[PDB]
Amino acid sequence: ASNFTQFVLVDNGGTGDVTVAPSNFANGVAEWISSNSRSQAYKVTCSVRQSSAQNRKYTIKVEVPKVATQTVGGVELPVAAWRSYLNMELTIPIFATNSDCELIVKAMQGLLKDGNPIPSAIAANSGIY
Amino acid sequence: ASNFTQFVLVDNGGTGDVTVAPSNFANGVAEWISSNSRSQAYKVTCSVRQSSAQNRKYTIKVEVPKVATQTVGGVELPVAAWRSYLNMELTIPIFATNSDCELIVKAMQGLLKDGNPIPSAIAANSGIY
Amino acid sequence: ASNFTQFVLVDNGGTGDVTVAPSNFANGVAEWISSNSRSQAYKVTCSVRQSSAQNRKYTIKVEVPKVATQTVGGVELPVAAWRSYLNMELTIPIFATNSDCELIVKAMQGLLKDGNPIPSAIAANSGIY
Amino acid sequence: ASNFTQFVLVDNGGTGDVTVAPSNFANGVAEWISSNSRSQAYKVTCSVRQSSAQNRKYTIKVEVPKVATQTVGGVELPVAAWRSYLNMELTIPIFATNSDCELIVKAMQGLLKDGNPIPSAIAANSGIY
Amino acid sequence: ASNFTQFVLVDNGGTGDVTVAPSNFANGVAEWISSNSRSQAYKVTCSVRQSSAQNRKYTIKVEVPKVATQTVGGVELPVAAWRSYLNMELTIPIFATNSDCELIVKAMQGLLKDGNPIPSAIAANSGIY
Amino acid sequence: ASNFTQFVLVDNGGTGDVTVAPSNFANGVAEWISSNSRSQAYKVTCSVRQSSAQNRKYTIKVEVPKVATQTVGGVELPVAAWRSYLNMELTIPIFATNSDCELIVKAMQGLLKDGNPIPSAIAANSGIY
RNA sequence: GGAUCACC
RNA sequence: GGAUCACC
RNA sequence: GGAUCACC
RNA sequence: GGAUCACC
């Protein structure tokens, strides 16, 4: 194995899927960027550290760009009009079994499943009510 | 709509699924917890607010219990040995349309989809290699 | 080659052997862990660097769990009562050829071979007498 | 018994084996040197101490010399062109059974077995990748 | 997936090829060293950093040794009589798409292609004329 | 005889090839520029000097432009939206025979050969991982 | 807390 | 700029 | 961390 | 070290 592989970040149903691929592991921060100019690329980073004697902490960041073409000095440059940033930190005790861990993964997957409260709020520029 | 409803957090395939239900709404912060003692419950909370003039930020927090060797209803100390804490912060610029937001949700669903690098590392008590 | 692969750490003769597999590579430090919670796992890490102008140094670290009376997946405290820590540092002058290095490995295999003074003392909770 | 016996440090297959024999136990540091001039001898030292109220710590050092004959002042002297130093410290809790200890020994033996990642890297002047 | 693997630095037909293998990835500086004595080995290092707001900057270094034996007072050591040091810094704006980077790469390969002015001047201890 | 001639810097099959032609050899600095507007042209410079008593030092520089049109107030000019700058310095002791220099050259060609770590990282807007 | 996001 | 080459 | 390796 | 790249 090697879990450092590419994957589809945005599954747009076979066409216009956004796949992100490995691009750097300097300083122990695993990085993946979409196949774009670095100014318009999607980026995902992940790093794990023993945040304490008894915890391990994963730090995952995702940047979703809104691409544009800005005219600077009379010249057109590929640019990102804005960026949406996701920052997540997961602290897991060292006493967690592989099954305990799989439980955390499933909880995170269910949280964002289509139709559930949270992804429905975000997608509608609303809050939970 | 009205999205503060009960949902399935851990899908164990119809049998032994973990449902989380509304439990508090003080301060506009929606809270959902599982049917357990608060020390052993699955807890999810979510709130939105405008972090700055240019952004809106969602703060989602999840607590997952260490289930292996757990004594249901018992007093388990130290608390930090028996719980995992997830903390997500999603920053979205005020220009993001509903469409932009749906894509942001897709990017999040993709990152955690089964079989991708990140969920596989977490689930296997691993980092990236 | 490509040597960051899974291997058998504890050979219990084909049955109940302990295999340790790649789990992290942040900072060029290869890590291998067994299939357990991180508190009960067998862990091995290895890195090389040039310690000085004249030497290269390998830093190998191993953690072995106290298995007698262990509760698989349980929370066992204090951590220091349930784990043994091995720490090896191998310093090799830049003049050592591959041949010189093979002999150095043989010297290490010899020291720990079954039946010699050192492994026998360790295994019997003894010193030298 | 008396585990303070001689042993073959480098098994060169019956011919040119490097056997190391007991040579000193002053100050509680057990020593073994190869049958050479003290300037060209292989040396192994071992000492155990109750590093703490609840630990015991073994300190093992091995020196592998690269022998030469240096001409000092117009005279030839048996000398070591350089030395490779191995330093290992093993900390074992006092709660470790003899079987727990045997497990540590096997882990150390498997680590260095021919063909496994670590001894393969060292022997090839390479790192783990 | 990884690009931190071994590769043929010098292709001398299929035999007498110089293969450089990964050795250390400390502080975002990837290092590859050829086998045998570290003293006579080839070395390649590479690192990338964001040199400024719009630029990323690669720093590649290569050392080619002149393999020789040093005899001093009758003790001979494997040394490098001397070394050539190559230091290249490639600056690339963040507006470069992957297509642009492939072009930057073909330009570098062309500069050094056999028969072109530059590699011919170097191979002949000459300058431009 | 001269090595100050034109050459294909970028080989795009046999068409869309970038040819750089001699332009100026002032002060021991050879310069080659591609055709058309000097503003959108490629540039290669090379010079050799005796950096020290035992060394000679080559300084090669290459600029790859991003061809674009600048419109300002209705007046459009042929410009380069931006440029990548390559700066390489090759140091070679005066003891190097022609054979040694040919080896230094094959090492440079190999570093950048297609598929090897370095040219692959660059062509993909990536680092080492 | 916050960001322009491995940063303050 | 120079190096003994991730230093100066 | 480091060594010339029971040392700093 | 940085560059707008034989400059700083």
CSV table of C-alpha atoms (C1' of nucleotides) in Angstrom, one decimal, chain B residues 49 51-52 55 57, chain G residues 1-5:
chain,number,residue,atom,x,y,z
B,49,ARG,CA,-22.4,33.4,11.9
B,51,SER,CA,-17.0,35.8,10.8
B,52,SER,CA,-16.1,39.0,9.0
B,55,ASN,CA,-17.2,35.6,5.2
B,57,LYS,CA,-18.5,30.6,9.0
G,1,G,C1',-11.5,34.5,17.9
G,2,G,C1',-9.8,36.0,13.1
G,3,A,C1',-7.4,35.2,8.0
G,4,U,C1',-5.6,36.5,2.5
G,5,C,C1',-5.5,29.9,5.4
